[PDB]
């Protein structure tokens, strides 16, 4: 088998920016990788398509995945509202790391963040499950619309998404 690859087509105020592809580490965190994969295809009847990155802090990360409230308070996994921290084998080693947002131990839903720098203080607390495969330049472009407090100056949305391989 091979690790699945998913893509997001990002738009800024409705204008297409570009595509970012991610490799999901199903071989190390199969349950977490599967949750993200299924939310990207929308196969369970809900998902990331049309949602926004509600919090972007330059030099830190881009956060998104709240497809229900769109403000950081919502979203849900494909296993129910929340699921356990699978493992902490992988670390936040640098730009491009894909990791799960949470509200403490065992509270994974649908929210995630893409790191734009090494964030070692999150190691052991947030489950790393993938990495940017192509399109890191689109992620860098995304940062331009963020701020120190996280509010974006333009609406950044996932116009389309799905599985490539």
């Amino acid at each position: 088998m091979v690790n699945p690859t998913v893509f997001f087509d990002i738009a800024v105020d409705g204008e297409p920016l570009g595509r970012v592809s991610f490799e999901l580490f199903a071989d190390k965190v199969p349950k977490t990788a599967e949750n993200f994969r299924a939310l990207s295809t929308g196969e369970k009847g809900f998902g990331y398509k049309g949602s926004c990155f509600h919090r972007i802090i330059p030099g830190f990360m881009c956060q998104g995945g709240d497809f229900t409230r769109h403000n950081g308070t919502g979203g849900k996994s494909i296993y129910g509202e929340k699921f356990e921290d699978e493992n902490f084998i992988l670390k936040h080693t640098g730009p491009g790391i894909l990791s799960m947002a949470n509200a403490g131990p065992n509270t994974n839903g649908s929210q995630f963040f893409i790191c734009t720098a090494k964030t070692e203080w999150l190691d052991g607390k947030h489950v790393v499950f993938g990495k940017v495969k192509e399109g890191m330049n689109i992620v860098e472009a995304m940062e331009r619309f963020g701020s120190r407090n996280g509010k974006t100056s333009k609406k950044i949305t996932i116009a389309d998404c799905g599985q490539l391989e």
Binding site: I57, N102, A103, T119, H126
Partner: peptide, 11 residues
């Protein structure tokens, strides 16, 4: 600080 939470964003 620099955390990534869902609901109560901390310092």
């Amino acid at each position: 600080x620099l955390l990534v939470t869902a609901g109560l964003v901390l310092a």
